[PDB]
């Protein structure tokens, strides 16, 4: 077991619930946080392996994840949403508008703002 | 009072003065929401005159009700539409003031006579918001509206 927590500014999903494993994305790869584990997020899928059978799927944009000495976790997401409430057709259109605005703008600060949005929208269509 | 109360009916135009207005330095201390005339009609003095005179009375009358509410509850509770009409009202109060030639020994300012054309235009512009950028005290104790613009630049330094 593990005292697993998972919430956002708007809504909260879990609060010290007994979960088996919770896969979470990151800047370097994708750690699968099992109950036994030693002591920064990226656009990707958060798969939550429950204690009994069913495995629900969420998505997280950005934030941080913590693993303490004792079995306790708090996954913090700025915007956490399920695959039930995510549009594929719009996510493709948003990925077109981002890649459109890449091929044109020349400012060094602005290209960062475009290229992050390309990565974020490309993580949505990977799931969707 | 029976004496002045009876006198009103005998008059075609009435200029009512107030101690409350004189107390604030506003000379001549005429009450703009009490003085009246028979000739104040769009058929006699024209609609452009009439519509500005009622616009001045409205903005002053609306401000008079607010004064007592915003003294306690503060200015920041007002709408942006209200505190626009508060700022305009206070400038309009001051532009109704005027230095007389006979009153030069009390004011310390030179006497000024403002023609009717420049009076109407002056209160027209302040109503429309053409001097919202300009400060409050530039309208106090000046003849035409032009002197407010000149005095506003003098108050910069």
């Amino acid at each position: 077991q593990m005292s697993f927590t998972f919430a956002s500014p708007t809504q909260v999903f879990f609060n010290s619930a007994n979960v088996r494993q919770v896969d979470v994305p990151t800047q370097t790869g994708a750690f699968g946080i099992l109950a036994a584990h030693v002591p920064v997020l990226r656009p990707g899928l958060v798969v939550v392996h429950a204690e009994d059978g069913t495995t629900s799927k969420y998505f997280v944009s950005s934030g941080s994840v913590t693993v303490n000495a004792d079995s306790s976790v708090q996954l913090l997401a700025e915007e956490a949403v399920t695959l039930d409430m995510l549009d594929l057709g719009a996510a493709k259109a948003n990925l077109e508008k981002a890649q459109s605005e890449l091929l044109g703008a020349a400012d060094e600060a602005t290209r960062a703002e475009i290229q992050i949005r390309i990565e974020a929208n490309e993580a949505l269509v990977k799931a969707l | 009072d029976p004496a002045p109360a009876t006198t009103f009916a005998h008059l075609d135009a009435t200029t009512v003065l107030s101690r409350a207005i004189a107390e604030l330095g506003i000379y001549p201390a005429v009450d703009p929401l009490d003085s009246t005339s028979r000739i104040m009609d769009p058929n006699i003095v024209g609609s452009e005159h009439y519509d500005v005179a009622r616009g001045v009375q409205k903005i002053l009358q609306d401000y008079k009700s607010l004064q007592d509410i915003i003294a306690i509850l503060g200015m920041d509770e007002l709408s942006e539409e209200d505190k626009l009409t508060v700022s305009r009202a206070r400038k309009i109060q001051r532009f109704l003031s005027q230095p007389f030639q006979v009153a030069e020994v009390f004011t310390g300012h030179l006497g000024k006579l403002v023609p009717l054309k420049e009076t109407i235009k002056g209160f027209q512009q302040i109503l429309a918001g053409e001097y919202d950028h300009l400060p409050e005290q530039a309208f106090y104790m000046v003849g035409p509206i032009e002197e407010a613009v000149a005095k506003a630049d003098k108050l910069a330094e």
Partner: protein, 160 residues
């Protein structure tokens, strides 16, 4: 003293009695949606765990603004978020400012408000109790863990 004076005072205070009645009603409406968004943000904030002061623009709420202002000069003399933070505490410490903020307290304070505060580069705030009362590992992986958790602590002070 005079009848004309007393009739004027009744005219104003009648409206203020209705306006004060209206403002507690609007405060009760905002209190409802603030309470219902509190416990989702509270576990988020507690799970996460230069002088900054947090309150709002709108006055007429007792000593909410002055309480955070009193503890800032306490921390300043030993060693701002809101328009009322400036009006009170500014001319005394006018050369000790990085940033000041306006347009807060009216609408619900979002996470995007905490980002804009953090982007411009202890924290003092009023922690809620009840209806009446209040109270005043790689090298680069910790760098991004610091900056996001910094936005969470600023967001925690906003919702409280």
């Amino acid at each position: 003293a005079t009848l004309k004076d007393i009739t004027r005072r009744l005219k104003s205070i009648k409206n203020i009695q209705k306006i004060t009645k209206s403002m507690k009603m609007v405060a009760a409406a905002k209190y409802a949606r603030a309470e219902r968004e509190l416990k989702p943000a509270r576990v988020y904030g507690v799970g996460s765990l230069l002088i900054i002061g947090v309150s709002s623009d709108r006055g007429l709420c007792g000593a909410i603004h002055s309480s955070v202002a009193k503890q800032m000069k306490s921390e300043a003399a030993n060693l701002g978020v809101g328009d009322k933070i400036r009006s009170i505490l500014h001319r005394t410490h006018s050369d000790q400012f990085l940033v000041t903020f306006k347009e807060v307290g009216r609408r619900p304070p979002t996470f995007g408000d905490a980002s804009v505060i953090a982007l411009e580069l202890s924290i003092i705030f009023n922690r809620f109790r009840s209806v009446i009362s209040y109270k005043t590992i790689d090298a680069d992986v910790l760098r991004n863990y610091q900056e996001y958790s910094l936005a969470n602590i600023i967001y925690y002070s906003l919702k409280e």
